[PDB]
Design a protein around this nucleic acid. Structure first.
Ligand SMILES: [Mg+2]
Ligand SMILES: [Mg+2]
Ligand SMILES: [Mg+2]
Ligand SMILES: [Mg+2]
Ligand SMILES: [Mg+2]
Ligand SMILES: [Mg+2]
Ligand SMILES: [Mg+2]
Ligand SMILES: [Mg+2]
Ligand SMILES: [Mg+2]
Ligand SMILES: [Mg+2]
Ligand SMILES: [Mg+2]
Ligand SMILES: [Mg+2]
Ligand SMILES: [Mg+2]
Ligand SMILES: [Mg+2]
Ligand SMILES: [Mg+2]
Ligand SMILES: [Mg+2]
Ligand SMILES: [Mg+2]
Ligand SMILES: [Mg+2]
Ligand SMILES: [Mg+2]
Ligand SMILES: [Mg+2]
Ligand SMILES: [Mg+2]
Ligand SMILES: [Mg+2]
Ligand SMILES: [Mg+2]
Ligand SMILES: [Mg+2]
Ligand SMILES: [Mg+2]
Ligand SMILES: [Mg+2]
Ligand SMILES: [Mg+2]
Ligand SMILES: [Mg+2]
Ligand SMILES: [Mg+2]
Ligand SMILES: [Mg+2]
Ligand SMILES: [Mg+2]
Ligand SMILES: [Mg+2]
Ligand SMILES: [Mg+2]
Ligand SMILES: [Mg+2]
Ligand SMILES: [Mg+2]
Ligand SMILES: [Mg+2]
Ligand SMILES: [Mg+2]
Ligand SMILES: [Mg+2]
Ligand SMILES: [Mg+2]
Ligand SMILES: [Mg+2]
Ligand SMILES: [Mg+2]
Ligand SMILES: [Mg+2]
Ligand SMILES: [Mg+2]
Ligand SMILES: [Mg+2]
Ligand SMILES: [Mg+2]
Ligand SMILES: [Mg+2]
Ligand SMILES: [Mg+2]
Ligand SMILES: [Mg+2]
Ligand SMILES: [Mg+2]
Ligand SMILES: [Mg+2]
Ligand SMILES: [Mg+2]
Ligand SMILES: [Mg+2]
Ligand SMILES: [Mg+2]
Ligand SMILES: [Mg+2]
Ligand SMILES: [Mg+2]
Ligand SMILES: [Mg+2]
Ligand SMILES: [Mg+2]
Ligand SMILES: [Mg+2]
Ligand SMILES: [Mg+2]
Ligand SMILES: [Mg+2]
Ligand SMILES: [Mg+2]
Ligand SMILES: [Mg+2]
Ligand SMILES: [Mg+2]
Ligand SMILES: [Mg+2]
Ligand SMILES: [Mg+2]
Ligand SMILES: [Mg+2]
Ligand SMILES: [Mg+2]
Ligand SMILES: [Mg+2]
Ligand SMILES: [Mg+2]
Ligand SMILES: [Mg+2]
Ligand SMILES: [Mg+2]
Ligand SMILES: [Mg+2]
Ligand SMILES: [Mg+2]
Ligand SMILES: [Mg+2]
Ligand SMILES: [Mg+2]
Ligand SMILES: [Mg+2]
Ligand SMILES: [Mg+2]
Ligand SMILES: [Mg+2]
Ligand SMILES: [Mg+2]
Ligand SMILES: [Mg+2]
Ligand SMILES: [Mg+2]
Ligand SMILES: [Mg+2]
Ligand SMILES: [Zn+2]
Lengths: 174, 204, 140, 37
RNA sequence: CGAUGUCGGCUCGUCGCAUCCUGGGGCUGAAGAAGGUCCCAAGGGUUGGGCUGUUCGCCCAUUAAAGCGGCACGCGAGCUG
RNA sequence: CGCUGAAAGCAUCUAAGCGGGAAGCCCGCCCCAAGAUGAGGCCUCCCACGGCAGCCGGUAAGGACCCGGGAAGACCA
């Protein structure tokens, strides 16, 4: 019943250096700087980072859980990394890898090409499955959301770009 | 950005792919560079061009010194082209090629004191049905006690023309370097013999 | 006895660093200096206050949501000629005017008040070109 | 989006949230989305 | 009340937005196309004619649309009458 | 409309932070514009003239008048 006080297991070997207003997380897959409120104290223990708040006021209670999750996401991101899968559905609808770029054929008069931002890698295992992967959890979910927005799931047909695991909710036509 | 100073010479039309093409003919070059405007010295980039040789007698001493400093024969007109730094020291009609699009600035023909109908295309008044000495008049110029005044910029009679006007995106139809001639499709501001400025167009 | 009236005095040039200071709370002090009301011989009908140089005026600070919500306004005299500019954009485009406007509104109206405003010299950035006047640094 | 002065839970999946100074009701049923106004 | 000229038209605009159109949206009993309803939005645009002094309205032919209000029911030291 | 995300173990576009998004807003286009008295900048020309921050006079760089005119114009410009 509290995220801010939950200690953060830090696997070896990722390092967590604390600094004014931020903490830096180095790991096997890159670095991430987490900007952290100065009112919160970030504490480095043996294989564990902890976050402490200076009072029980609402703002401190709110920054407390945020700051723990932010740091934990960076810790996961440099060790495990983050990924998000997209399933394409609909007859003509396919995807392919163009160099490093993502090309979607999804029923427009033209293909839609998505460039990767730095820290993002696109995978296309099969033509109806796309993988967005990177160390930055926020960035991964952003890029995945941008690609879904290109042709959202239709309200009447299993057609469009879906998050893997997204339920298919269709209302009736005629 | 590139540009040249010129003289509007007249209008005709040519035939191109079995189409009559109205053209204004411009005697443009040649324009010696007379001063360059640099960010270090002047705070911006431009080139002061000269145009038309002048009877040196008519050139006073401060102008003479100006032409001397940039070893150049005395010229009748100095105009700057903004954001233009030509590699050479003489600008000629060849900076444009047929097919390019240009903007042309001239001084429009002067209407002098113009009525509200000529200057602003007001409808004037009826010419019968009782209309009383208001056939070319502007009608109402306001409201009543609120606001009890007339707006700034209200359209009224007054001097009209002899002003700077730029026509944009004119097609260059031909360039004749042997005569420093530019053929521009359509209409260009001002009278024949008028000074004009021809610049690369700002429309993408 | 009549009240002392001062002969013309050489005015005092001062330098103020605006960085981090609160926009309006700094301005009240500058207007005081411009009026010369810090001076024991203050006279209301002569310009006898300080000349005030300000640096880092672009680093002036402000509370609440004023960066987005404070609106400066200009009226051109034409129909529809009310221009609204937020603090944000003014700081991005003419930052020295933010402090200049605050101080001007705190000076008296009239010929002397406008004269006093000319004795205020406001600069974005840490530098100013008045080294020859050798301004005395003030912590206010 | 229904825009009204009285915003209320319509069904038990409805959630009354405050967002950027405004009371919204969000829900899995799109008819129930509400903004106070 | 030792005078603040009145309806309607014409002319000339300008503003409000409770938006007629065009731009952006959510919901739909939204398959598509076309609509309905609400939200944002005043930048521009918003036709010609028959009837009647008319404003308004009805009608004809179109239109993206043929918006509604304020300005002394805007405007007669501007015209009409 | 989102992403990441607590308070509130879930959830939440938001409280920290980030993204997308209108013929509309700022700029971009065209015209005026330093009486912008906050009177700006650059190039070039003149010069330290006599007599008694002032005055008198003759000049300097230049300017004005006058005249021939002008797709400039009521005049003037
Ligand atoms: Mg460790
Ligand atoms: Mg402790
Ligand atoms: Mg000209
Ligand atoms: Mg004329
Ligand atoms: Mg007229
Ligand atoms: Mg006309
Ligand atoms: Mg006209
Ligand atoms: Mg008419
Ligand atoms: Mg007529
Ligand atoms: Mg008539
Ligand atoms: Mg009559
Ligand atoms: Mg008559
Ligand atoms: Mg009239
Ligand atoms: Mg009246
Ligand atoms: Mg008034
Ligand atoms: Mg004129
Ligand atoms: Mg040809
Ligand atoms: Mg002509
Ligand atoms: Mg003080
Ligand atoms: Mg403040
Ligand atoms: Mg500035
Ligand atoms: Mg005041
Ligand atoms: Mg007073
Ligand atoms: Mg209930
Ligand atoms: Mg929900
Ligand atoms: Mg009466
Ligand atoms: Mg009387
Ligand atoms: Mg009376
Ligand atoms: Mg009377
Ligand atoms: Mg009536
Ligand atoms: Mg109106
Ligand atoms: Mg509205
Ligand atoms: Mg619309
Ligand atoms: Mg629409
Ligand atoms: Mg549809
Ligand atoms: Mg249907
Ligand atoms: Mg249907
Ligand atoms: Mg709709
Ligand atoms: Mg709504
Ligand atoms: Mg809404
Ligand atoms: Mg509008
Ligand atoms: Mg308007
Ligand atoms: Mg309108
Ligand atoms: Mg008839
Ligand atoms: Mg008939
Ligand atoms: Mg009729
Ligand atoms: Mg009628
Ligand atoms: Mg009739
Ligand atoms: Mg009727
Ligand atoms: Mg009837
Ligand atoms: Mg139609
Ligand atoms: Mg329609
Ligand atoms: Mg009609
Ligand atoms: Mg009205
Ligand atoms: Mg009434
Ligand atoms: Mg009435
Ligand atoms: Mg009336
Ligand atoms: Mg009316
Ligand atoms: Mg009237
Ligand atoms: Mg009358
Ligand atoms: Mg009348
Ligand atoms: Mg009247
Ligand atoms: Mg009257
Ligand atoms: Mg009148
Ligand atoms: Mg009157
Ligand atoms: Mg009549
Ligand atoms: Mg009668
Ligand atoms: Mg989430
Ligand atoms: Mg709960
Ligand atoms: Mg926030
Ligand atoms: Mg954004
Ligand atoms: Mg945004
Ligand atoms: Mg998006
Ligand atoms: Mg944007
Ligand atoms: Mg357009
Ligand atoms: Mg100019
Ligand atoms: Mg000047
Ligand atoms: Mg100028
Ligand atoms: Mg002023
Ligand atoms: Mg000057
Ligand atoms: Mg300058
Ligand atoms: Mg002479
Ligand atoms: Zn519900």
């Amino acid at each position: 019943s509290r995220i801010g006080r939950l200690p953060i297991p830090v696997p070896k070997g990722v390092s967590v250096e604390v600094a004014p207003g931020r903490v830096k997380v180095k790991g096997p897959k890159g670095e991430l700087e987490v900007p952290v409120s100065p009112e919160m104290r970030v504490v480095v223990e043996e294989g564990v980072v902890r976050v402490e708040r200076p009072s029980d006021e609402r703002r401190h209670k709110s920054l407390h859980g945020l700051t723990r999750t932010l740091i934990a996401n960076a810790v996961k991101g440099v060790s495990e990394g983050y990924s998000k899968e997209l399933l394409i559905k609909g007859i003509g609808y396919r995807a392919r890898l163009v160099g490093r770029a993502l090309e979607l054929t999804v029923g427009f008069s033209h293909p839609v090409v998505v460039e990767p931002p730095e820290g993002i890698t696109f995978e296309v295992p099969e033509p109806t499955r796309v993988r967005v992967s990177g160390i930055d959890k926020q960035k991964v979910g952003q890029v995945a959301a941008n690609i879904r927005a290109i042709r959202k799931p239709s309200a009447y047909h299993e057609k469009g770009i879906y998050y893997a695991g997204e339920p298919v909710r269709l209302k009736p036509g005629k | 950005m590139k540009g040249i100073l010129g003289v509007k010479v007249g209008m005709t039309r040519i035939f191109r792919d079995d189409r009559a093409v109205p053209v204004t003919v411009i005697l443009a070059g040649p324009c010696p560079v007379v001063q360059r405007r640099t960010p270090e010295k002047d705070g911006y980039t431009a080139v002061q061009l000269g145009f038309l040789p002048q009877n040196p007698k008519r050139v006073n001493r401060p102008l003479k010194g100006h032409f001397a400093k940039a070893g150049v024969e005395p010229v009748r007109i100095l105009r700057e082209i903004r954001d233009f730094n030509p590699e050479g020291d003489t600008v000629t009609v060849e900076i444009f090629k047929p097919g390019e699009r240009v903007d042309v600035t001239g001084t429009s023909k002067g209407r002098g004191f113009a009525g509200v109908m000529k200057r602003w295309n007001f409808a004037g008044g009826p010419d019968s049905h009782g209309a009383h000495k208001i056939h070319r008049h502007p009608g109402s110029i306001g409201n009543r006690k609120t606001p009890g005044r007339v707006y700034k910029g209200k359209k009224m009679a007054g001097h009209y023309g002899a002003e700077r006007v730029t026509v944009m995106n004119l097609e260059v139809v031909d360039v004749i370097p042997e005569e420093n001639l530019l053929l521009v499709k359509g209409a260009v501001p001002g009278p024949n013999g008028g000074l004009v400025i021809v610049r690369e167009t700002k429309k993408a | 006895m009549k009240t002392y009236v001062p002969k013309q005095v050489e005015p005092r040039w001062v330098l103020i660093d605006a960085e981090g200071k609160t926009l309006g709370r700094l301005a009240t002090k500058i207007a005081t200096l411009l009026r010369g009301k810090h001076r024991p011989d203050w006279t209301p009908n002569v310009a006898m206050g300080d000349f005030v140089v300000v640096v880092n005026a672009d680093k002036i600070r402000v509370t609440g949501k004023k960066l987005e919500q404070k609106i400066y306004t200009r009226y051109s005299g034409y129909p529809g000629g009310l221009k609204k500019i937020p603090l944000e954009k003014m700081l991005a485009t003419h930052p020295e005017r933010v402090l200049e406007h605050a101080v001007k509104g705190m000076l008296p109206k009239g010929p002397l008040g406008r004269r006093l405003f000319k004795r205020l010299k406001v600069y974005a950035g840490p530098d100013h070109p008045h080294q020859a006047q050798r301004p005395e640094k003030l912590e206010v | 989006m229904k825009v009204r002065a009285s915003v209320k839970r319509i069904c038990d999946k409805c959630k009354v949230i405050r967002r950027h100074g405004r009371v919204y009701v969000i829900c899995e049923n799109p008819k129930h989305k509400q903004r106070q106004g």
